[PDB]
Design a binder for this molecule. Structure first.
Ligand code: CLA
Ligand code: CLA
Ligand code: CLA
Ligand code: CLA
Ligand code: CLA
Ligand code: CLA
Ligand code: CLA
Ligand code: CLA
Ligand SMILES: CC1=C(/C=C/C(C)=C/C=C/C(C)=C/C=C/C=C(C)/C=C/C=C(C)/C=C/C2=C(C)CCCC2(C)C)C(C)(C)CCC1
Ligand SMILES: CC1=C(/C=C/C(C)=C/C=C/C(C)=C/C=C/C=C(C)/C=C/C=C(C)/C=C/C2=C(C)CCCC2(C)C)C(C)(C)CCC1
Ligand SMILES: CC1=C(C/C=C(\C)CCC[C@H](C)CCC[C@H](C)CCCC(C)C)C(=O)c2ccccc2C1=O
Lengths: 49, 66, 665, 253, 69, 99, 79, 121
């Protein structure tokens, strides 16, 4: 049902896709770093909500 | 009164006819749901009113006189 | 600008504004229509410029009315009040700026408030408001009254002038960017900064002296002097039981700075996502759209005010003034409900008069899912109560939903204040105490959600199906306020957005009544009361903590809340203080019952009865040429709704206020 | 444009050149000739016909103040980009395409996607496209449900559906029934679940006897025979699934 | 007092005989009728006796039709 | 209309063409029809003017008397007087001791 | 001037109250249902109108309806 | 003398130049559960924005336009709106399940409000 090749201004699906990919890449690096740091120094990136 | 409830029934019927499994079995053609007519609803509300009013007293009289 | 066209000639025409009323007074329906359409400036004779003129001038006239009411409040406080006795000793003396005459034995209404004063105990918190503002003298109150009266006169003059200053070219009311910027930067930002200045310069010294016990004129005529490093709200004034007024002043300064910053970033265009709202910006440049949005905003703010005025104490001694806090909460909750249903109404009017937004094109799924969620919420939430009732009656408490039995723990209801253990007390009363949530709170909160969702369902259905529906496709042609489309198609009663509001008001009233009862009972049982002696206190609550044990059943609500706590109002006749409250209880019951007349009956019976009655008048030559008519269908609905809501609200008002007054005195 | 008399050499005091350009751009072209009464362009026309070169070159302070009050400033009118965005939005909606959004807290977010709102039948409200029902995943899932799966006999459909239904149905009575604390809680819950399966299967038999759906029927077969077979096998599968769940509960505590 | 009120009123209605006067009261005439209503007992008995009080039922609408025409 | 007597009231077509001063020495004023019943006409100034522009409304005793003759004011005044009379009777002779 | 002829009572007008006889199609539409059509290459359509041999619901109530009129009371001219 | 238009079944006419440009909504006829239809066909000199009786708005093509609805009431309301716009050539047809087309609204080619010869009470 999606129309990716629509020449309207309200067609920022490329923006949505790139946002997804960039956030996912950052989250990959972040989760690997969190796990490695927890395993090494017992630091799990404690949050102070 | 009836118009509000007829429109609500129309929306509910739309939901039933859009449901995946239910649509393929139930068309809605036979006994198509409808809101109660004006006189039917007058009578039903009167029956509820009368039943509540009459039947809420005997408990009170029994409790007080027993 | 031309004031020669304002003459009293039109005063006696009585219907000039509406063209449909040209054939003056052929029936009483004409009178009723005159009143109904008096303030519907859109459908009145004239032009859009005249509509804007009337809207703005009426807003200013209402502003003057509110200023007059505030000035009257100040005058009553100054001259017809025991504010002096209350200020010196708030606990002993109940607030009272209200005195009744001795006409027919009516002096019995006045009750003992002080040694030298007898009157009616007020519950508006005006004494606490004055104390917070630093008003401690009759001269100060008198000058506040004078300022309010001067503001009333100024607003009246402004309305009268603007009725002619604004011409057909006038467009300042369409400058939404300018309007919003001015309101955000000056009315809100500068206003908050100026009030923080007022607090710091006047209220802080006076309030500090009052807390100490100093009442010296020279002193009455060094910020953060007494406030420790404790977070605001985590430490209440030990001698007043309220947040430090210096903390309040700092709050207002910060809020004003934040508002100014928001306005300045908007001015600089720092906000970027204009497109996401551009559709609404284009669609909702309408009187009714803005009225609906503002009504909803103020309804939500009123509800937040109702919650915060009690949960977060900021006025001196209002925490221990139990009638005041209760009345404030209840009043603002009721206003929230009324303004929310108003927002629904004017959303419907905007849809009728203007093009709706595109979310109306999939209205069937929206209302269908709302119907389902309403049904499921009502079923589960109320059927838990019904299950508790049935099982407890059968004699199986172990099968009911309660803390001792099956328990529905509110896991998500988590603390955020991080307060220290214990409670805060002030002179034999519990100013602040944590509310402990359990199965009863879970059930009552889901009842709240159910009622809110059903009211929203009615309002949203009225809004979305205003233009047309499967039943009738020309509802737009029918308009906004029509009784029906006919007995056809099964019957098209109450298909109009007006009738959708007429039902949403019933549902809002039901929701707010349940909310009021929940707040009242929970506060009486688990928060308010006295204490009996590191020290540990046993807290004796007014309702004796019966909410958590009895609120789990509808019978418990009927017995421990209505019947048990109606002892004060029901037995108030002999007592001088609350005999008026008992009488108002009775009269509100009468009015509520009388509303059912109009809510159940129909136009035709009354029209035929009126004709039969008029036969005798004609026989005796009493011929009324304004021919009597039965009230229209919509008017009958409106009258029934008004009387119903007024009677219910009056019963609740008298009941709660009598209980609180007797318990606290 | 040059053909408009009142728009020629409008004095800067009455309205700035940039603001005039913005106002003309915002206003529809056809309205320039004789704008409607309640418009900034109408006010500008009315006052430029009376003031300017060759006409009244002075105005009272109050009259000028009111004129500047009721004429528009530059920031009040829409920009080129804003007008383009609004035009694109309206064009999309009229073409039958919806810039996808999901409601959020007291609002809705735009996901940046353009979907085809109108279905194959343009006038059919049943066919409006949505990811929930008309997406590839939803289509495949619903088509692969037992009620719909290809190459399945009615007995297979009913057996699978009943297995699922009974297996999950026994549990509520087992855990929250009156005898939930008694040693026979599991068996009583199994009995209640089997009763529920029987009741729903009886209802399905009534449905197939009254409405008689014929989508599962073989060619040259009695109407609703396939549906009745499916319902009977749903009853069988419900019994089996309830028994299996009860056996698992009993064996594994 | 009640007969005074009723008489006054009926007298205003008879004298005016107009919806416009019913809406915009002719205050002079209204006050005149209010003052005049003090002799209502004698005036009413005299009108009843002389036939100026009640009109025959054939001069007024009887009600809905209960039969075929 | 006596208010604008002696004023030079030019139509919008004659704006700037007529520059004759008024009786009060003010410049001519442009008159425009607005098609508003409340303000049928509006006047703009061609320059600084020294003229009387009353902001007070034109109210006639006849209009006030008609407004009070409106049935609402008549009956509200009647009812207010009646209620005041009953209240004062209750004040002066409480409890109906005479009866 | 109405071409429709009342079947029950020739003197009276047709219950339909129309003046132009109906137009039959070249080939009458056959019974169909909206279902999925797996594309054989991994694709799938949602609302595909596919032929259905008989009535979708063989209830007497459903099958008795012919659509000629409100009560199927229009004469042969209705078809 | 009156000629009944072909008016193909909506399920057959998936895309046509006649259909006006309209937004679409859930207020359209339920294709799964109903088969009877009503078609309204008119001719417009210009593209006038008009409101569909089923939900949102629409734009009528310059030339011939055709719309499908479920009820004669919807068709007649749209026809009244077109008459307000001074489009007097619109016709309404009822489409049976099998494709039979019955010319309905201008039953004899003259609008009912206008008196016509050959009409009997
Ligand atoms: C975006 C992802 C991300 C982020 C924000 C961080 C952030 C951090 N990492 Mg790194 N880290 C990452 C990915 C990331 N890491 C990955 C993918 C790995 C695996 C190769 C590591 C492995 C790693 C180690 C082994 C250590 C850090 C450490 C640190 C700290 C460096 C700054 C400092 O010295 O103070 C900081 C908390 C140091 C630290 O202080 O850890 C507690 C440290 O010793 N990181
Ligand atoms: C919100 C506005 C408001 C309200 C609800 C009230 C209400 C009241 N005022 Mg009033 N009052 C107000 C504003 C208001 N006031 C203002 C602005 C001022 C001056 C600043 C006063 C000054 C004032 C005084 C000086 C007194 C009252 C009194 C009263 C009480 C009796 C009134 C009476 O006998 O009327 C009588 C009825 C009428 C006047 C009829 C009104 C209609 C006709 C046409 C006139 C009553 C509770 C009296 C009181 O409390 O006595 C114990 C009293 O002495 N008021
Ligand atoms: C909501 C409150 C409000 C608002 C938004 C406005 C808005 C306006 N007033 Mg003001 N006005 C108000 C209250 C308000 N007024 C009140 C209460 C009064 C009575 C004292 C007046 C009396 C008044 C007069 C007498 C005049 C205005 C004028 C104006 C304009 C602003 C020009 C000006 O002098 O700005 C600076 C501040 C504008 C139509 C002027 C106008 O329209 O000039 C063309 C004008 O002459 N107002
Ligand atoms: C100078 C700073 C300052 C101060 C002293 C206060 C003080 C106050 N604010 Mg706050 N407030 C501030 C800035 C400040 N505010 C700012 C910048 C905003 C954004 C505009 C707000 C928005 C705001 C709202 C919306 C509300 C308050 C409220 C309050 C009151 C109770 C707050 C409480 O108990 O929090 C408890 C403290 C904490 C949970 C600690 C966290 C502190 C930060 C986040 C670290 C109190 C008078 C409430 C009120 O008026 O109740 C009657 C209320 O509803 N404030
Ligand atoms: C009248 C009551 C009301 C209220 C209190 C709000 C409140 C809000 N709306 Mg709005 N909204 C309303 C009515 C209302 N809306 C209506 C009637 C509509 C339908 C047209 C919308 C449509 C709408 C949209 C389209 C959006 C909002 C959004 C928002 C948020 C803006 C602030 C923000 O994101 O700050 C946080 C930023 C820092 C906020 C929660 C925005 C949001 O994120 O909503 C989820 C948003 O994009 N609203
Ligand atoms: C409310 C109680 C209730 C109801 C309404 C039914 C209904 C049914 N049961 Mg029974 N059943 C019940 C309780 C109940 N059961 C209980 C408590 C048990 C013990 C676990 C069983 C065990 C049971 C078995 C073992 C079988 C049935 C079957 C049936 C069917 C009998 C008629 C038939 O041949 O249909 C034809 C269909 C019908 C669906 C039979 C069935 O499913 O046949 C297909 C079957 O074999 N039931
Ligand atoms: C493969 C499936 C399966 C399995 C492993 C079990 C296992 C069990 N069932 Mg059975 N049961 C089944 C299917 C199954 N059931 C079905 C389909 C039904 C529905 C009719 C039942 C209904 C049922 C009941 C009503 C009871 C059992 C009971 C039992 C126990 C003893 C059975 C035995 O040895 O009987 C040997 C004789 C043959 C045991 C936990 C009994 C028990 O101990 O329950 C706690 C018991 O009361 N079952
Ligand atoms: C026919 C009815 C009636 C009668 C016989 C009286 C008689 C009396 N009133 Mg009055 N009074 C009336 C109606 C009446 N009143 C009404 C309707 C009101 C409500 C406003 C009042 C309110 C009122 C007050 C508050 C007071 C009196 C007082 C008095 C006494 C002196 C006269 C006076 O001040 O009149 C006043 C009559 C009016 C109609 C008030 C005018 C109202 C506005 C301003 C319109 C003019 C006298 C016993 C005074 C007195 O002597 O008290 C000891 C006194 O204090 N009256
Ligand atoms: C697909 C399927 C299915 C299906 C189902 C169904 C489809 C169902 C339905 C069902 C039904 C369909 C049911 C029914 C029911 C019924 C009822 C519930 C009834 C009631 C009744 C009443 C209530 C009545 C009454 C009466 C009487 C008896 C007499 C007279 C009077 C009166 C009217 C009152 C199942 C799940 C199985 C499984 C899977 C597969
Ligand atoms: C959405 C969601 C979800 C859902 C889920 C579900 C809904 C599930 C279901 C589940 C189920 C519902 C399951 C079931 C299963 C079943 C089974 C596993 C069965 C079995 C059976 C058997 C095995 C049987 C057998 C038999 C028979 C049939 C007969 C004869 C006898 C015997 C025994 C042989 C969740 C939560 C995840 C979360 C996320 C989201
Ligand atoms: C009673 C009733 C009537 C008849 C009621 C009428 C005509 C109202 C009478 C109006 C009077 C004349 C207004 C004057 C106000 C009261 C007489 C004030 C009494 C105050 C007391 C304190 C004395 C309807 O016409 C009607 C129409 C549609 C739905 C329901 C109903 C309905 O319930």
């Amino acid at each position: 049902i999606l129309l990716e090749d629509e020449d309207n201004y309200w067609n920022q699906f490329r923006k949505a896709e790139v946002q997804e990919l960039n956030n996912g890449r950052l989250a990959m690096m972040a989760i690997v770093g969190l796990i490695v740091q927890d395993i090494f120094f017992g630091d799990f990136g404690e949050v102070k909500v | 009164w009836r118009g509000y409830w007829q429109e609500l029934i129309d929306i509910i019927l739309y939901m039933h006819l859009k449901t995946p499994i239910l649509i393929d079995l139930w068309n809605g053609g036979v006994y198509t749901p409808l809101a109660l007519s004006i006189v039917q609803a007058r009578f039903i509300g009167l029956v509820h009113f009368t039943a509540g009013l009459i039947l809420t007293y005997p408990p009170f009289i029994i409790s007080t006189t027993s | 600008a031309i004031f020669r066209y304002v003459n009293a000639t039109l005063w006696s025409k009585a219907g000039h504004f509406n063209k449909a009323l040209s054939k003056g007074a052929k029936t009483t329906t004409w009178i009723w229509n005159l009143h109904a359409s008096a303030h519907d400036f859109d459908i009145q004779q004239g032009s859009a410029g005249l509509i804007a003129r009337k809207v703005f001038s009426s807003g200013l006239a209402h502003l003057s009315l509110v200023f007059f009411w505030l000035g009257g409040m100040h005058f009553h406080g100054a001259y017809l009040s025991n504010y002096s006795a209350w200020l010196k000793d708030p606990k002993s003396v109940a607030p009272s700026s209200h005195i009744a005459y001795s006409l027919v034995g009516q002096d019995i209404l006045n009750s003992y408030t002080s040694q030298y004063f007898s009157g009616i105990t007020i519950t508006s918190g005006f004494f606490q408001l004055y104390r917070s503002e630093g008003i401690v003298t009759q001269s100060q109150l008198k000058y506040a009254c004078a300022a309010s009266l001067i503001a009333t006169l100024i607003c009246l003059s402004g309305s009268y002038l603007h009725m002619q200053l604004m011409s057909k070219f006038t467009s300042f009311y369409k400058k939404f960017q300018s309007l919003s910027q001015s309101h955000l930067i000056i009315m809100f930002g500068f206003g908050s900064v100026s009030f923080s200045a007022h607090q710091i310069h006047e209220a802080l010294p006076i309030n500090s002296l009052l807390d100490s016990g100093i009442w010296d004129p020279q002193l009455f005529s060094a910020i953060l002097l007494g406030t420790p490093s404790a977070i605001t709200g985590k430490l209440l004034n030990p001698s007043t039981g309220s947040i430090f007024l210096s903390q309040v002043a700092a709050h207002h300064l910060a809020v004003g700075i934040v508002f100014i910053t928001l306005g300045l970033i908007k001015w600089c265009n720092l906000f970027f996502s204009r497109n996401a709202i551009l559709s609404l910006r284009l669609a909702y440049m309408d009187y009714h759209a803005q009225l609906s949005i503002n009504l909803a905003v103020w309804a939500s703010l009123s509800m937040v005010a109702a919650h915060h005025l009690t949960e977060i104490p900021v006025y001196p001694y209002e925490s221990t003034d139990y009638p005041t806090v209760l009345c404030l909460f209840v009043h603002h909750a009721c206003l929230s409900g009324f303004f929310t249903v108003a927002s629904g109404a004017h959303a419907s009017i905007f849809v009728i008069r203007q093009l709706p937004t595109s979310e109306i094109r999939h209205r069937d799924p929206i209302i269908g899912h709302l119907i389902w969620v309403c049904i499921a919420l009502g079923l589960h939430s109320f059927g838990l109560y019904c299950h508790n009732d049935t099982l407890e009656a059968l004699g199986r408490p172990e099968d009911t939903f309660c803390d001792n039995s099956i328990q529905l723990k509110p896991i998500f209801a988590k603390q955020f204040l991080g307060l220290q253990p214990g409670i805060e007390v002030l002179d034999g009363k519990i100013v602040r105490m944590t509310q402990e949530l359990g199965t009863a709170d879970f059930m009552v909160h889901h009842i709240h959600a159910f009622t809110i969702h059903v009211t929203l369902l009615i309002l949203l259905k009225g809004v979305l199906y205003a233009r047309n529906s499967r039943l009738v496709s020309d509802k737009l042609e029918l308009g906004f306020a029509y009784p029906c489309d006919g007995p056809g198609r099964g019957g098209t009663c109450q298909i109009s957005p007006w009738d959708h509001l007429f039902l949403a008001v019933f549902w809002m009233y039901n929701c707010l009544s349940v909310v009021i009862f929940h707040y009242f009972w929970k506060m009486q049982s688990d928060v308010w009361g006295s204490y009996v002696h590191h020290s540990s206190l046993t807290c004796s609550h007014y309702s004796q903590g019966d909410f958590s044990v009895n609120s789990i059943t509808i019978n418990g609500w009927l017995r421990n809340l209505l019947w048990s706590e109606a002892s004060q109002v029901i037995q108030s006749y002999a007592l001088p203080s609350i005999c008026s409250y008992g009488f108002i209880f009775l009269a509100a019951h009468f009015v509520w019952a009388f509303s059912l007349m109009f809510l159940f009956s129909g136009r035709a019976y009354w029209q035929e009865l009126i004709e039969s009655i008029l036969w005798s008048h004609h026989k005796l030559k009493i011929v009324p040429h304004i021919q009597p008519r039965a009230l229209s269908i919509s008017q009958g609905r409106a009258v029934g709704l008004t009387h119903y809501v007024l009677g219910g609200i009056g019963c609740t008002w008298a009941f709660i206020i009598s209980r609180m007054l007797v318990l606290t005195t | 444009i040059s053909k408009i008399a009142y728009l020629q050499d409008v004095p800067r005091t009455i309205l700035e050149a940039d603001v005039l350009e913005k106002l003309l751009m915002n206003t529809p072209r056809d309205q320039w000739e004789d704008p409607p009464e309640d418009t900034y362009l109408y006010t500008l026309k009315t006052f430029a016909e009376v003031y300017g070169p060759g006409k009244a070159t002075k105005m009272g302070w109050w009259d000028y103040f009111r004129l500047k009050l009721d004429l528009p400033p530059g920031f009040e009118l829409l920009d080129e980009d804003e007008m383009k965005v609004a035009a694109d939005y309206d064009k999309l909606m009229m073409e039958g395409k919806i810039p996808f959004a999901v409601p959020g807290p007291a609002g809705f977010w735009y996901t940046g996607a353009v979907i085809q709102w109108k279905g194959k039948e343009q006038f059919a409200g049943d066919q409006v496209q949505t990811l929930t029902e008309n997406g590839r995943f939803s289509k495949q899932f619903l088509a692969n449900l037992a009620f719909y799966r290809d190459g399945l006999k009615p007995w297979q459909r009913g057996l699978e559906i009943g297995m699922a239904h009974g297996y999950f149905l026994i549990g509520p009575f087992t855990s929250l029934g009156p005898l939930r604390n008694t040693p026979e809680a599991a068996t009583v819950g199994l009995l209640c679940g089997c009763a529920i399966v029987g009741l729903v299967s009886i209802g399905g038999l009534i449905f197939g006897s009254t409405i008689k759906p014929t989508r599962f029927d073989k060619e040259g077969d009695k109407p609703a025979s396939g549906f009745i077979e499916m319902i009977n096998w749903h009853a069988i599968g419900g019994l089996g699934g309830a028994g299996f769940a009860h056996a698992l509960i009993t064996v594994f505590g | 007092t009640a007969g005074w009120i009723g008489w006054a009123g009926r007298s205003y209605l008879i004298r005016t005989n107009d919806e416009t006067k019913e809406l915009n009261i002719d205050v002079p005439l209204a006050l005149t009728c209010m003052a005049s209503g003090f002799s209502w007992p004698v005036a009413a008995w005299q009108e009843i006796v002389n036939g100026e009080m009640a009109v025959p039922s054939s001069q007024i609408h009887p009600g809905g039709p209960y039969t075929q025409s | 209309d006596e208010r604008d007597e002696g004023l030079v009231l030019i139509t919008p077509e004659e704006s700037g063409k007529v520059v004759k001063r008024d009786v009060n020495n003010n410049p001519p004023r442009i008159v425009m029809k607005t098609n508003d019943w409340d303000q049928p006409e509006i006047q703009l100034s061609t320059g600084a003017s020294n003229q009387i522009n009353y902001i007070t409304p034109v109210v006639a005793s006849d209009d006030i008397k008609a407004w009070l003759s409106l049935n609402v004011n008549f009956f509200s005044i009647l009812a207010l007087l009646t209620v005041g009379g009953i209240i004062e009777i209750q004040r002066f002779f409480p409890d109906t001791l005479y009866w | 001037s109405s071409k429709w002829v009342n079947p029950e009572d020739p003197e009276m007008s047709h219950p339909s109250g129309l003046y132009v006889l109906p137009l039959k199609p070249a080939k009458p539409q056959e019974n169909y249902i909206y279902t999925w059509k797996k594309g054989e290459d991994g694709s799938i359509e949602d609302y595909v109108k596919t032929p259905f041999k008989g009535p979708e619901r063989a209830a007497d109530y459903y099958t008795q309806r012919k659509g000629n009129g409100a009560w199927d009371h229009w004469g042969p001219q209705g078809e | 003398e009156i000629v009944v238009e072909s008016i193909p079944r909506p399920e057959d006419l998936l895309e046509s130049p006649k259909f006006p440009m309209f937004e679409g909504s859930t207020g359209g006829y339920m294709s799964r559960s109903t088969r009877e239809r009503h078609a309204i066909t008119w001719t417009a000199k210009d593209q006038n924005k008009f409101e569909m009786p089923t939900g949102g708005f629409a734009i009528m093509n310059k030339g011939e336009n055709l719309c499908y609805f479920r009820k004669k009431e919807q068709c007649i309301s749209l026809g009244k709106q077109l008459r307000k716009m001074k489009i007097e050539n619109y016709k309404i047809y009822r489409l049976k399940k099998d494709g039979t087309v019955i010319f309905m609204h201008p039953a004899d080619g003259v609008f009912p409000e206008k008196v016509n010869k050959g009409r009997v009470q």
